[PDB]
Paper text:
Lipopolysaccharides such as the enterobacterial common antigen are important components of the enterobacterial cell envelope that act as a protective barrier against the environment and are often polymerized by the inner membrane bound Wzy-dependent pathway. By employing cryo-electron microscopy we show that WzzE, the co-polymerase component of this pathway that is responsible for the length modulation of the enterobacterial common antigen, is octameric with alternating up-down conformations of its L4 loops. The alternating up-down nature of these essential loops, located at the top of the periplasmic bell, are modulated by clashing helical faces between adjacent protomers that flank the L4 loops around the octameric periplasmic bell. This alternating arrangement and a highly negatively charged binding face create a dynamic environment in which the polysaccharide chain is extended, and suggest a ratchet-type mechanism for polysaccharide elongation.
We purified and determined the structure of the fully intact polysaccharide co-polymerase WzzE from E. coli by cryo-electron microscopy to an overall resolution of 3.2 Å. An overall resolution of 3.4 Å was obtained without the application of symmetry and, although clearly octameric in nature, displayed a loss of octameric symmetry in the region of the L4 loops at the top of the periplasmic bell. In this region the L4 loops are seen in two conformations, one up and one down with, remarkably, the subunits clearly alternating between the up and down conformations around the octameric complex. Although the application of C8 symmetry did marginally improve the overall resolution of the map to 3.1 Å, the alternating nature of the L4 region was averaged out. Thus, in order to resolve this alternating arrangement of loops, C4 symmetry was applied by using two adjacent subunits encompassing the two L4 conformations as the asymmetric unit resulting in a 3.2 Å map. The high quality of the C4 symmetrized map allowed the complete amino acid sequence of the periplasmic domain to be built, including the dynamic L4 loops in alternating conformations. Within WzzE, this alternating arrangement of the L4 loops results in a subtle rearrangement of its two flanking helices (α6 and α7): when in the upward facing position α6 helix is tilted approximated 9° outwards away from α7, and is slightly elongated suggesting that a slight unraveling occurs when L4 is in the downward position; and when the L4 loop is in the downward position α7 tilts slightly inwards towards the center of the periplasmic bell. Thus, as a consequence of the up-down nature of the L4 loops the full octameric structure of WzzE contains a 13 Å opening at the top of its periplasmic bell nearly double the distance compared to that of WzzB containing all downward L4 loops at 7.5 Å at their narrowest points.
Author numbering:
A (entry chain H): 105 to 260
B (entry chain A): 53 to 208
C (entry chain F): 53 to 104
D (entry chain A): 261 to 312
Amino acid sequence: VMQLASWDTRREFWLQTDYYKQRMVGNSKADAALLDEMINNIQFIPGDFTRAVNDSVKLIAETAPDANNLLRQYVAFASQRAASHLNDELKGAWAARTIQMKAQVKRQEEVAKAIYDRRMNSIEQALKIAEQHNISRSATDVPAEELPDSEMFLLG
Amino acid sequence: QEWSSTAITDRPTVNMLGGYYSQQQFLRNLDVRSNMASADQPSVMDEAYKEFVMQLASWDTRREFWLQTDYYKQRMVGNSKADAALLDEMINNIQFIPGDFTRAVNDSVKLIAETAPDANNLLRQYVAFASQRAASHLNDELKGAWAARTIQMKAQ
Amino acid sequence: QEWSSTAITDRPTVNMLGGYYSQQQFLRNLDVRSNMASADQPSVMDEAYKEF
Amino acid sequence: RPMLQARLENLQAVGPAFDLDYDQNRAMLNTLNVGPTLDPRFQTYRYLRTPE
């Protein structure tokens, strides 16, 4: 609907169509006046849901077959422009989402590496202390693995 | 002569916002986790368009644009009073008509100049100027929010 | 002679609010784990502009 | 005495225990300290009627 009601879409459609090229006079002012006159030939009447009236488009032309073909082509043109814009917006949102996901994955990897390094350091210190105190008994405490890192040395 | 021209603008797309969209999405995601205030707030596009509209109709923006437009500088008699009066008149030349969503009419800006090409070039330059100012203001706001979030995270 | 001038103002932004914004946000964060406040509360800049 | 001394030595050499939340906060703070990337001249509007 936004593409339908826009002035730019009407101007580009009239510039592209053959109904306007054959009516060119060759004078810039006359061509501009003709284009502006044919811009208003397409009127968009917005619809209201309360009164059960839908959006409508009216086109005006010199000849009835033209008045039909031009309207069909203009509606197709507006639909194509809307589809292209929607595709571009979808691509932009996709790029933003993948950037965010990459950043989140990087952060999770950093967190995992930090935890791994901390556990490695704790393992090294526990090994050194167990060697110093010569506690070679493999079984020292009833609780199984996943002990808190603080009293982690209670192992062979 | 007082030739006039009209422009109609709407919200930008994701693809044209650039990296600012991703940065603001990151900050909003951070705000979601702590200090929950989202409450399905308006998207980044709405905020950017609101800032652009605010900079479009501001008297200060029109004054600063006219002061450097290179079209006002030619019409400088050299008297302070005459220059001030002309500047006020030309500031009043640019008008902004806000749009109503109920009637499906959008925001429009109308510029009045002395010659026909100047009614177009000056309007294009003014819209670009307002967009640039809005972008700079949005970048400053993003920097401030980023600094505040960094300080809060450091404290936590 | 009766000359006149006019000014138009609006709500400030985070950047010009200085360090007060961080303190107020910290207090609000302390105030959402106790004595529940409305989730859709007016923001800091809105309150500052209302006071102004 | 031996086990108590070993507990003291181990808890001294290990340091304070940090949960997963602290590590996640540190990781996020790293990216926050990286700093935002500011690019100007990005458009904030789209044209429905180009001036002519």
